Symmetry: C2
Subunit: 569 residues, 2 copies
Amino acid sequence: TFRRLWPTIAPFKAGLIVAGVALILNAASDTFMLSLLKPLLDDGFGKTDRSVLVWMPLVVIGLMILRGITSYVSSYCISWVSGKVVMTMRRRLFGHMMGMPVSFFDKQSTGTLLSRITYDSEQVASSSSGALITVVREGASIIGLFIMMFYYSWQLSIILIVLAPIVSIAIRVVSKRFRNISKNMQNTMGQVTTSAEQMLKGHKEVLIFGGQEVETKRFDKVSNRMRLQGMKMVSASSISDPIIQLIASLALAFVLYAASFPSVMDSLTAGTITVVFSSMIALMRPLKSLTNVNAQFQRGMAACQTLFTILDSEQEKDEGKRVIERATGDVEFRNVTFTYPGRDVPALRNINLKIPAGKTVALVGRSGSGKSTIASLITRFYDIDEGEILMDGHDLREYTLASLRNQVALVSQNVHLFNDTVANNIAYARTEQYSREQIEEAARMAYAMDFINKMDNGLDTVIGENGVLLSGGQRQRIAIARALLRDSPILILDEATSALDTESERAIQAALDELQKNRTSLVIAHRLSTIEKADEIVVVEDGVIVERGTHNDLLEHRGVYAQLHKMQF
Amino acid sequence: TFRRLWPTIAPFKAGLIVAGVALILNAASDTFMLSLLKPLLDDGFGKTDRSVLVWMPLVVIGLMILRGITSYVSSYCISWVSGKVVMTMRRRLFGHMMGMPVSFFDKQSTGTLLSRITYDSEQVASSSSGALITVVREGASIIGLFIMMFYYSWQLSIILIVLAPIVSIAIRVVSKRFRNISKNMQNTMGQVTTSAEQMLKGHKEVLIFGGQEVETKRFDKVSNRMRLQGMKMVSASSISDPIIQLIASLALAFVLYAASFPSVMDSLTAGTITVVFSSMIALMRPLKSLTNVNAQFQRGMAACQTLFTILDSEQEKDEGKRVIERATGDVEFRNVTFTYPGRDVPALRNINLKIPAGKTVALVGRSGSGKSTIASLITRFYDIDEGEILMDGHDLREYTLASLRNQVALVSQNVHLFNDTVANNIAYARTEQYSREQIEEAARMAYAMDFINKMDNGLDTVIGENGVLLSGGQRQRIAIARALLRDSPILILDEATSALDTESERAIQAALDELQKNRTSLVIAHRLSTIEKADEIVVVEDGVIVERGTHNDLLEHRGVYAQLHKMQF
Ligand SMILES: CCCCCCCCCCCCCCCCCC(=O)OC[C@H](COP(=O)(O)OCCN)OC(=O)CCCCCCCCCCCCCCCCC
Ligand SMILES: CCCCCCCCCCCCCCCCCC(=O)OC[C@H](COP(=O)(O)OCCN)OC(=O)CCCCCCCCCCCCCCCCC
C-alpha cells in the first residue's frame, strides 16, 4: 500500500543516501573480488614468474578491510535512521494513548498495549529498512555480475541467459507434476489410516464377542496396505529429484559443447571461464532474495496500519463550557443509569443520590453490586448513558475535563507512585507552584514524616519502582499526604481493605479522619468503624438505591442494611 | 542406546547392505566430477586442444545418469527395509493393545493412541535410517574429498588441514566474545522497557492528578534512551561479521602467499588450484551434516522407547482357568464396592443385587451416576475394588475371561459395526460354526429382514463405515440380531434410546420384547414402558440401593420411585 509514513522519515534523509552510497560499494567490492580469479588462475599459477601471488594477498585483504568498513558504515547510517523514526513514532503513540477514554485501556490490557510501542513499532523499521538494503545491495550485485559476465565473454555469457529461463521452466513443470502426484496418492493413504481408526474405537466389541484372532488378521491386511502405499509415495519423491539435476546437467552439457566451435570460442583460457561460471552461481543468491522484497515490505508496512489505527482513534469527549475554580457546593445524582462498554446487562439502573456540602455519605454494596462504579462517573472516567449528574448546581458535561478532575482526589489503597522523588510524588504535576516547605507541612499533617525521615536522602529519595520499594501500608499514607496538599474539595475515599496491622493502620485511620473535616466525602465503606459516623448511610441494592437513611433509621427496618450489618458480624 | 530394535531388522540385512554399496558409489560420483575440473581448466579450455570439450559433456551426462540410478536404488532399497520394520512393529502394537485392560483405553488415550501406530512408529525408521544415510554417504564423501585433495597436491592440501583449526577456534572465540556482550547489553533494554511499562499502568493517576505534560516530557527521556541503547546492540553485532570475515580471509591470503615461495613448496598448474580449492568448499556441507548424527539417532531411538513402554506393559488379568459352557444360574451381587481408576471418590459403594433365573431387573437411577457402572462389572471390563460378584454359584475370578465374556451380550443404542459384509457383523468371530441359513433365520426373527433385503446384494454388502452405512435404528436392530444369533444366556440392555420414530421404534421394541423371553435381563432403564412390565425394580443413586420393589409395591412408598414417574410426568 501507499502510506503517510514518509513525512516522519523525510527529515532523516541524510542517513538513507549514505547507506546507499556506502552500500553499493559493499556490492561493487564483492564483484571486484571475483574478478581476481582471472589474473590468478590464468597467469598467476600456470606459468613462472610468481609475482601475481605476492601482488594478490595485498588486494584480497584490501578488498576485505574495505568490505568491513563499508559494512559497519552501512549498519550505523541505517540504524541511526531506523532508530530516529522508531523514536519519533513511539513518542506520538505515548502522546495520544495518555488522552483516550479510560474504557479503552481495559478491553486492551497494559501488556498487550505495550506490544504496540516496543514490538510492533520496530517492525515498521525492521522490515522496511530490511527491504531497502536488499533492493539496493542485492539489486546492485546483479547489475555488477551482469557487466562482469558480459565484459569478459559475451559469447558464453549470452548462452547463459537463453538456457537459464528454458532450464528454469523445465525444472518447474517437472517439479510440479511430481507435486500433484505425490499429493494425489497422499489422500489415498488417508483412506487407510482412517480404516485403522475404525477398529481401535470398538475395543469393547472386540473383547465381548470373542473376536481377538479375527481382528488381528485384519491388521495383517490393512497394515500391509499402508506400507505398500507408503512405499509408493517415496518412489514418487525419489524420482522427483534425479531428473531435475539431469535437466540441469544437460544445461552444463551444451555450454561446454557450445564452446568448442571456432567462432563462439576464440580462446576462453583458464580464467574467463572460472569468472563467468563462478559469477553464475554467485548471481543466484541475490535473485532468491530480491523476490521477497514485496513479501517483506508488506510485512513491515502492514504493521504500520495496526498502529496508525491507534494513532487516529477518537480521544475523550472534551465538550467544555466553563472553568470551575472550586466546587463550593454539592454533587447530586438525579436518575442516572449506564452500562460498561463491553458488557450487555445494565450495571447500575436509575439512581438518585446527593452529596451535601460539609457532609459525608457511605455506599455498601459489599456483595458486589457495583458499589465501586459510583466513583468513576463523578470523575468522568466512564461517561453516563442516561440521566444527569450535577456539581455545584450544573451538569458535569458542561465543564472542561481539566478543571473537573482538578476538584477531585481519589484516595484509595491502590495508588500508582511515579518513578521520581518523594518531593514530587507528594506534589505531583504542580511542583512549580508548591514549595518544599509546604510539602513538609503536608507530610507532617498526614503523619507520614516518620517513613520519609527514615529515607537516606530525606525528601529526594527515589520512591517509585526500581527505587526504595515502599510497602503497601506506606503507599496509602502518601496518598493522604498527596490529597491533603492539593486541597481538592471532593473526596471519594475507597477504604476497600480493612487491615488490622496496628500502629501502621492506626496512623492511616487517624490520618484519614483528619482529612474528613471539611471536604465533602464519599466512602465506599468496607470498615464498619467509619460507616456509623457518616451523616447519611446509603446502600446499593443491585442496580438501584432502595434503602436510604441514617444508621439507626435503616437498622430498625430490616431490609438488607440490617442483614449487611449481620454479614459484617 | 538400548537398541533392542535390531532383532526386528536382522531378517532384513539385504536392503541395508545394498543401500551402502549403492550409496558409496553415489558419494564417489560427486568426487569423480570435481576431478573433471583439472583436465578442463588446464588441458583444453586454454589451448588449441578442442577435444577435452568434445568427450567431456557426455561424461557429465554419464555420471549424472549414474548418480540418479544410484540414488534411486539407494532410496528404494532403504524404503523397503524402513517399511518392513515399521509394518512389523504396527502388528505387535496392534496385537498387545487389543488384550489389555479397558481402563487404559477410556481417557488416558482416545485419539492420541493412533499417533503411536501412525506417527511415533514412523518416526523410528525415519530418524534411524536418516542417521545411516547421513553417516555412510557423508562419511565416504569426506574420504573421497580427502583423498582427491591429497592426491592432486599434498603440499597445498596439508596447509589447509593444519591451517583450518587455527581459523575455526579463532572464529568461535571471536564470536563468543560478541555473543556474551550482546547478551550483557540485552538486559539494559529490559530494564528500560520495564521503566516505560511502569508509566502505562497508572493512567487513572495520570489523568485525575492533572499531569499530562510531565508524563510526556518524561517519555521524551525514557524513549531517547531506548534508541541509544538499541543502536548500541546493532553496533556491537555488525562488528562481529566484518571481523570473522577478515579472520577467514587472512587464511586465504596466507595460503596464496605460501604458494609464492618456490623452494620446494608448491608447483601447481591452475587446475590443481581449482580441484583442491573447490573440494574444501564442497567438504563443509558433509561436515556440518555429520555433526547432527547423534542428535538424530536419539530423536529416533528415544521415540522408540515410547513404543517399548506401551509394549511390554501389563495385559489384562487372565488369572483363573475354570470353564463355563452355559451360565444356567443367576448373577448374585453381594456387598460389592468399586471405584474407577484415575479417581478416588467412590462411584459405587456396597451394593447387593440379584438376577434370578428367568427374571429381569431395572436399574433406575436416571440422575446420571451409579446405574451405568452395574453393567461393566459382570463382563469384567473393570475389576472390583472389594467384595465379590458371583455367577452361577461361583465368583467371576475363577472362570476364564474368554469363557465369561462370551456368556453376556451388551445390547445398546451405540453399537460398533465392523467394516465387513452384513454376514460377519451378524456372526462375528464365529463364521465357521454358524451357517448362512441360521443367519437368515436370526435376521428374520429380529425383523431386520426388511432392511437387509433392501441392500443390493442382500447378505454380502459392506455394512460398516466406508460402505453402505446405516441409521442408528438399523444398527440397534443388527445388535439385537447378533445377540439373538449368539444365544448367550445373559442379557444387559442399555436402552438409553428415548427414540420416538414410529415404524422403526415399533420394530425395535417388538424385537427387544421377543429377545427377553429367556436370557435373564439387567435392563438399564430410561423409557417407562419396560419399567412397568418387569419382575423387580431397584433404584441406585451414588451407589446407594435405597428402594427395591415392584412397580406397584414401590409406588405406595414415595421414596424416589414415586418421584421417578414425576420426572417423566
Ligand atoms: C548502479 C550502481 C553502481 C554499480 C557499480 C557496479 C560496478 C561493477 C564493476 C565491475 C568491474 C569488473 C571488471 C574489473 C576489471 C578490473 C581490472 C582487471 O582486473 O583487469 C583484468 C584484465 C587485464 O588482465 P591483465 O592483468 O593484463 O592480465 C593479462 C590478461 N589481459 O582486463 C581486461 O582487459 C579484461 C580481459 C580482456 C578482455 C578482452 C575482450 C573485451 C570485450 C569487450 C566487450 C564489451 C561488451 C560488448 C557486448 C555488450 C552486450 C550488451
Ligand atoms: C602425504 C601423502 C603424499 C602422497 C604423494 C603421492 C604422489 C603425488 C604425485 C602428484 C603429481 C602431480 C599430480 C598429477 C596427477 C595426474 C593425474 C591424472 O592425470 O589424472 C588421473 C585420474 C583422472 O584421469 P582423467 O582426467 O579421467 O583422464 C582423462 C584423460 N587424460 O585421476 C583421478 O581420477 C584422481 C581422482 C580420484 C578420485 C578417487 C575417489 C575415490 C572415492 C572412494 C570413496 C569410497 C571409499 C570407501 C569409504 C568407506 C566408508 C565406510
